[PDB]
Design an enzyme around this catalytic site. Structure first.
Site: not given
Ligand SMILES: CN(Cc1cnc2nc(N)nc(N)c2n1)c1ccc(C(=O)N[C@@H](CCC(=O)O)C(=O)O)cc1
Ligand SMILES: N[C@@H](CCS)C(=O)O
Ligand SMILES: [Zn+2]
Length: 761
Positions: A19, A124, A502, A528-529, A574, A657, A674, A701
């Site tokens: 990363k 995932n 989160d 992105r993790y 998740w 969504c 969405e 987005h």
């Molecule tokens: C596609 N997506 C939606 C998504 C997918 N899996 C999840 N899984 C979990 N456990 N929690 C979530 N909120 C989540 N959200 C994502 C996936 C990664 C990142 C992301 O940017 N991660 C950050 C850190 C994420 C964090 O700090 O919680 C990074 O910089 O690696 C954002 C959205």
């Molecule tokens: N209530 C959340 C939904 C994300 S799917 C938001 O508006 O970010």
């Molecule tokens: Zn949403």
């Protein structure tokens, strides 16, 4: 001597090194040389780890800077022409395909959009969609370096012989799609064009010294048309020969048996099957193995974090051996370890009792080695006893078993999962209570967080401000957000969620039955993790999780305020789930816990409540049938358990969504989905469905602020197919990621648009 095998290793780095270097390279802070050197260091470190653990069959080509599927697209020249017009070097074409490209205006400014990211099965992980045209000319991109050959040779120079991993031709095509200039193209039709390219690749691998190749064909776990099934014979008869490595045709995440005829007469050297997801397919897949073909038994889970029961896993392996011979069985990870965090030894905070229940990717290496030793006849009694001790400890722990939660599950019945009255009745009560106008306007929950809120969240986390002072900062941010929505005329408000960082962890930390990691990162897409929570035990909710901030937000406006919860299915999907109880049971426990929360919000005066279920599609079983229909049923039941305790005048919203039958099954008063990017038919599927719907009117987005007139037309188009009495107006999703000026004029436009429809109606 039964061998051990790993199908792939996470590449992110135990310290997220991958990363940090990729993001530095994209931001201009690192050079391509520094990028490539870091990638080499990671591959060496991971091969050595595996060699040191004693793994026999070690993968190569499982590394990537972004996504292994996109790496194959670059390698075979499946590169849409639009990416090739910017004098980018091959690594930069790669990154352009994955994450887009923006260039200054001279021509108007360049913004080339990335290729589509797609979920990889029910994992995932996300891959970059292979994208093909009629003109696509598949060939090896020799000047770009040939990644699998180069990485194989890199490993060999460290004294580590590896097995290259490539996605096979049937899966690679079948998972792809036709580009916008070739909408009549069926990807699988390109099989005769791509086969020679795989054959050249495989020749080059053999010439480099590779004697075996792991060739992944995971589409064998899907429902496949008959005309696709016949393609495996075609493909593999072409590929296998004296001039290429032996091929191990590799499947994971599900059941191959409906496609068994497809693979029963192949010239490959062996197969791999996932006996963690589907142990019951063993007998039948063993039954088709030809003389000399080998069977890789996937018995160490590549997708979850629990310590493997060595006794049970050796027993599966032994059943294989009894069918086909010790000489022809391999002990393997069920899938690549891409889906697991890197190393449990990095965790600084987990109690040793809980850590004893876990194995991350580094630990799974030792597991496959010990299991192969056990079935080979070595005295590993020590490791077995130690392992059996661990298993037994978890089984009995009170953490796992909460009798109160068990007792509550028995109370689940139809009444618990049904509102007090049907929608038409409820609607009468909600019209009296809220008197909302036609085309009511709302948003999805989150708004942009100031810099000061993020700095204060850090300071609170060190005690540099008191809990009282952080609460004041959060309320100030809520006030700002409520004031804004009032001034622009929105009808149903939200609090902006500034206190939440989160969508799942915010709730997990407030629920019993969860554990959290410090370094449990898994790649989700690109750089992105995610760091998923772990469900360790029976789930319950001790106290109010969200009520305070919502009551504050409601207290400063006469507009209805949405409470805001993540649904049970999303929290489950998740998280790393328990492997000792069904997903169904976990979701129902989560449903009951969230029911207490809905109940407490309603009681505190928060009588409009939204439940967010973004991950509903994501757990959908991979094949049609009973498993799939059961899932849809329990997913809906668990949402209904969360939401059915409320009064008729309480307005339940669900945000997605998905199958309209499933949406209807949730019986939400109002849904948002969405919808701004489709078929006018699905819309007509909810013609006669009385419950109300808000189809997202703009892409959150992106940021290209639509005009008032832009909204009017998007709405006029929905109205042609959908009654005005049911229509809500909202964005596609939350606005956490967007900037205030975009938010403000877009929202102001959206409202001004709705009011014009109120005048006309
Ligand atoms: C596609 N997506 C939606 C998504 C997918 N899996 C999840 N899984 C979990 N456990 N929690 C979530 N909120 C989540 N959200 C994502 C996936 C990664 C990142 C992301 O940017 N991660 C950050 C850190 C994420 C964090 O700090 O919680 C990074 O910089 O690696 C954002 C959205
Ligand atoms: N209530 C959340 C939904 C994300 S799917 C938001 O508006 O970010
Ligand atoms: Zn949403």
């Amino acid at each position: 001597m039964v061998q051990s095998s790993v199908l792939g290793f996470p590449r992110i780095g135990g310290q997220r090194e991958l990363k940090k270097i990729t993001e530095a390279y994209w931001s201009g802070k690192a050079t391509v040389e520094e990028l490539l050197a870091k990638g080499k260091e990671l591959r060496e470190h991971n091969w050595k780890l595996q060699q040191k653990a004693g793994v026999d069959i070690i993968p190569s080509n499982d590394f990537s800077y972004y996504d292994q599927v996109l790496d194959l697209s670059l390698l075979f020249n499946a590169i849409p022409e639009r990416y090739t017009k910017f004098d980018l070097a091959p690594i930069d074409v790669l990154f352009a395909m994955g994450r887009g490209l923006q260039a200054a205006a001279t021509q108007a400014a360049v913004d080339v959009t990335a290729l589509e990211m797609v979920k990889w099965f029910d994992s995932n992980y996300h891959y970059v969609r292979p994208t093909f045209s009629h003109s696509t000319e598949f060939k090896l991109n020799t000047a770009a370096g040939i990644k699998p050959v180069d990485e194989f040779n890199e490993a060999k120079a460290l004294g580590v012989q590896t097995r290259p991993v490539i996605l096979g031709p049937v899966s690679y095509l079948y998972l792809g799609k036709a580009d916008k200039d070739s909408l009549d193209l069926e990807p699988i039709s390109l099989l005769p064009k791509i086969l020679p390219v795989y054959k050249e690749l495989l020749q080059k691998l053999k010439e480099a010294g590779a004697e075996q190749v792991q060739i992944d064909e995971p589409v064998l776990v899907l429902d496949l048309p008959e005309a696709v099934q016949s393609k495996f014979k075609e493909a593999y008869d072409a590929l296998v020969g004296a001039d290429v490595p032996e091929l191990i045709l590799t499947t994971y995440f599900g059941d191959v048996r409906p496609n068994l005829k497809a693979i029963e007469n192949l010239p490959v050297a062996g197969f791999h099957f996932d006996f963690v997801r589907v142990p019951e397919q063993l007998d039948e897949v063993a039954s088709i193995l030809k003389d000399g073909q080998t069977l890789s038994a996937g018995v160490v889970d590549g997708r979850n974090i629990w310590k493997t029961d060595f006794a049970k896993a050796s027993a599966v392996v032994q059943k294989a051996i009894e069918k086909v011979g010790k000489d022809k069985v391999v002990v393997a990870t069920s899938s690549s370890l891409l889906h697991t965090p890197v190393d449990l030894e990095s965790e600084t905070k987990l109690d040793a009792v809980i850590k004893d229940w876990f194995s991350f990717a580094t630990q799974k290496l030792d597991e496959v080695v010990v299991i192969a030793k056990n079935v080979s006849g070595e005295d590993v009694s020590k490791q077995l006893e130690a392992n059996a001790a661990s298993i037994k400890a978890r089984s009995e722990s009170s953490i796992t078993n909460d009798p109160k939660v068990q007792e509550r599950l028995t109370t689940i019945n139809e009444a618990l999962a049904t509102r007090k009255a049907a929608f038409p009745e409820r609607l009468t009560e909600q019209k009296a209570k809220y008197n909302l106008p036609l085309f009511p306007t709302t948003t999805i929950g989150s708004f942009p967080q100031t810099k000061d809120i993020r700095i204060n969240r850090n300071k609170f986390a060190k005690g540099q401000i008191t809990a009282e002072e952080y609460e004041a900062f959060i309320n100030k941010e809520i006030e700002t957000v409520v004031r804004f929505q009032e001034e622009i005329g929105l009808d149903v408000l939200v609090h902006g969620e500034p206190e939440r960082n989160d969508m799942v962890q915010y709730f997990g930390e407030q629920l019993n039955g969860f554990a959290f990691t410090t370094n449990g990162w898994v790649q989700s897409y690109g750089s992105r993790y995610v760091r998923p929570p772990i469900i360790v035990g029976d789930v319950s909710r001790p106290k109010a999780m969200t009520v305070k901030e919502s009551v504050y937000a409601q207290s400063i406006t006469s507009k209805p305020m949405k409470g805001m919860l993540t649904g049970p299915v999303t929290i489950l999907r998740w998280s790393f789930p328990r492997d000792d109880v069904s997903g169904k049971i976990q979701a129902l426990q989560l449903g009951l816990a969230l029911r207490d929360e809905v109940n407490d919000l309603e009681g505190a005066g928060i009588t409009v409540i939204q439940v967010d279920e973004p991950a509903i599609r994501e757990g959908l079983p991979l094949r049609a049938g009973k498993e799939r229909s059961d899932y849809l049923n329990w997913a809906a039941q668990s949402f209904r358990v969360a939401t059915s305790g409320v009064e008729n005048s309480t307005q339940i919203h669900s945000h997605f969504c998905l199958d309209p039958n499933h949406i209807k099954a949730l019986d939400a008063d109002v849904v948002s989905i969405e919808f701004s990017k489709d078929d006018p038919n699905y819309i007509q599927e909810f013609s006669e469905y009385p419950n109300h719907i808000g189809l997202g009117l703009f892409d959150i987005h992106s940021p290209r602020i639509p005009s008032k007139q832009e909204f009017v037309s998007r709405i006029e188009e929905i109205l042609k197919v959908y009654p005005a009495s049911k229509f809500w107006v909202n964005p596609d999703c939350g606005l956490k990621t967007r900037g205030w000026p975009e938010v403000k004029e877009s929202l102001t436009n959206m409202v001004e648009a709705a009011k014009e429809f109120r005048a006309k109606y």
